Symmetry: C4
Subunit: 219 residues, 4 copies
Amino acid sequence: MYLRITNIVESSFFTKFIIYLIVLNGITMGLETSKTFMQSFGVYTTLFNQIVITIFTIEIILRIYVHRISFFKDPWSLFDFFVVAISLVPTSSGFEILRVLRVLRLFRLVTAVPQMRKIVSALISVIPGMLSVIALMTLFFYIFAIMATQLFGERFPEWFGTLGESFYTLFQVMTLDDWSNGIVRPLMEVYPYAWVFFIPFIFVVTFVMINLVVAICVD
Amino acid sequence: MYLRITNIVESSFFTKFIIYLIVLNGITMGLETSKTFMQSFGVYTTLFNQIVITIFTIEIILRIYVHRISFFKDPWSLFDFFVVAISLVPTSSGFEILRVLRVLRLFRLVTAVPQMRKIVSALISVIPGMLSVIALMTLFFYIFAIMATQLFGERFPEWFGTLGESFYTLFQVMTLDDWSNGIVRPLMEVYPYAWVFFIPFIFVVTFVMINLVVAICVD
Amino acid sequence: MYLRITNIVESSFFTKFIIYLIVLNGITMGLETSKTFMQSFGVYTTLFNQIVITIFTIEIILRIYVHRISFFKDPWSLFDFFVVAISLVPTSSGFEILRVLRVLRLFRLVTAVPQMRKIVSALISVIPGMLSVIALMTLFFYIFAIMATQLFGERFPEWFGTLGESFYTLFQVMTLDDWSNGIVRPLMEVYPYAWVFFIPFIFVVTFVMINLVVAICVD
Amino acid sequence: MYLRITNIVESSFFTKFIIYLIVLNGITMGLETSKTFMQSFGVYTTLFNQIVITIFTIEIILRIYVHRISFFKDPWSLFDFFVVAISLVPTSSGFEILRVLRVLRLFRLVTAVPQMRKIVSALISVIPGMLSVIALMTLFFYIFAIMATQLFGERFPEWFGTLGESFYTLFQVMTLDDWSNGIVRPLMEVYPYAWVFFIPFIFVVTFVMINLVVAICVD
Ligand SMILES: [Ca+2]
Ligand SMILES: [Ca+2]
Ligand SMILES: [Ca+2]
């Protein structure tokens, strides 16, 4: 039966049927957004939803008999396994985020269509050439975040009262979002010299980000 | 009579006469901004307007004889038809935006002057080389915008209550505009982990956006 | 006497004596900032100022005999002329910005020193290959600024009441400064669809601005 | 004993032991953040901290015998000296930042592990190409800041009262952070024309910065 199903699986119709289902389930989940639509046709939605999840498990079952170990060594394959997995956890218990993480299956439209795969892969491909810097930054963030927590988190615990918060705040300064009037100006009403901490910080972190951008304009 | 008018239309004088009306009508439309100017010379400029709109339809009518099916296959030409057409719809009824859309005819200074035409075309040509990325992002937005609406729209309907509002809010976070103490920090007062949605969101969407600019610094 | 003075003017001493005066006057101007320093050594600094102003006119006089027609055709020279002229307008009368524009003489350190000259010139030379785009943008701003004054100016005059006010607002949105919470969200409390005016505006204006940056990494 | 020690110091195991201590003292400093942790394991860590500091002074002493004058001419060596020297100053007297600047020793994970040094050096190397511009700007910032103080610091001393305050404000306007609603709009309720000072200031300073980024994407 193997070469029967391997012919079924590899069939354009099967792929196109899958891609068709995604773009239908995509449309379905945007309608699940409306409180109106849900009162009207929620049942229609929840069963069509449960149907699709079965069909996707069927497919993923078939897809593995036809690739075995080659499958679990394929990123894209792995992804699809993992996304439908989430979608499988019951409509109750644990963390309600799961019910929400389900919408991640609309990322299968990226996986099931090349060019997208191309583009995604084009994008991803740039990452390893950056991990040298990224690690540099995270070391930097970590070091300043600790200075911040023990320089400012007593009078300003919302922003710096905890390592986690200093990170968050330092990240915010880095996106340069409301970073003067929002955070540094106030800091200075108590600590005149907070500009000595954050102006160097800004320079470093912005400079680095410019280099990292130009690095992707080279390789 | 064809070659008579095909010599009128195709003439230098004709083109430079059209350009002369545009830069005149453009100056006329900025004087219609002032409530003062309108109480004195308002009548002058309303007629001057109807005059030019005639002249432009006369011209467009002429322009079509001289070109026929060639004309409805030229972008720049089509534009001028559509823009003058908008300028024809009576100063009443339906919606008033059409009265406001009339100011789009000053885009003819682009259409009817090279260099501008050149420069506009330079920019536009880059678009098809982005459409892979653009599509990617829209799918990304769509996925997150749905996830946000069902994670935050109950307590925070201003921002995430409707699919569209999540789109809007998400675009805002992307421009990195007051996303911290303007959206995220609030959200957190209720959903401590909301950083886990938005910090990732930010990496991806800024990352991508960096690439898309590096692409346009290659082609 | 000409070649005697033409030897004074071209003299390394003279050149370096000017450079010496600038950096001294510059330091003098940041001391004039302090209310304290002015209550102590104000008269010192006022005379030291009038002195230098003569020295710079004497020089610019000497400089002209030595160069004649050649001098009013040298950018860096013309500047130096005009910027000293400003410094000559009596410590009174007309506008008091003239008392303030006097600190533009410290832009002579750019003129009277190469490398600076080099770099400034390097920068400036990019401008002409941008005027095609800059033109395009101005037309765009002007078109959208008009629309906005006749679409939000009536209820929202602080931000769109006048053609000038809209230009400013539009410039603010373009720099993405508080554009959503500060501008578009409010607007939208009255005009639900203002987003249809601003999101496109923002795409266009930033796209164009991306190109112009890549343009200065082609040339 | 020189070659005995020159073989200890230069040894891989000595390096890998130093890197191992950094990564441990690193972890331990992010734990000293928790007030909880300090009330339980505080003594453990303060002792652990004083230990490593000796080990680092021992090492830095050893490192010097093995290199002599070659050592105080190596950036990376000097750094480690100065950072450990700070850490040597007793847990008392003076400013309190020295007790905080102590966390700068986690910058040794950069100095004493290749790849970072590479990347760091790749960064720094770019700086010399920038110092021509950087200077230009700093003359500019100095010039406008003086103008600003005498144009706006009487009504608006928070932001422009002092030469230093204007620096800071100008820096802020440059990062484009809340610059309209937060600074320039206000100024305008008193000085209608301040946009004439800040629109140009913004152009100039953003232009320059675009070049400077394009400069680094070529050299
Ligand atoms: Ca910003
Ligand atoms: Ca901002
Ligand atoms: Ca803000």
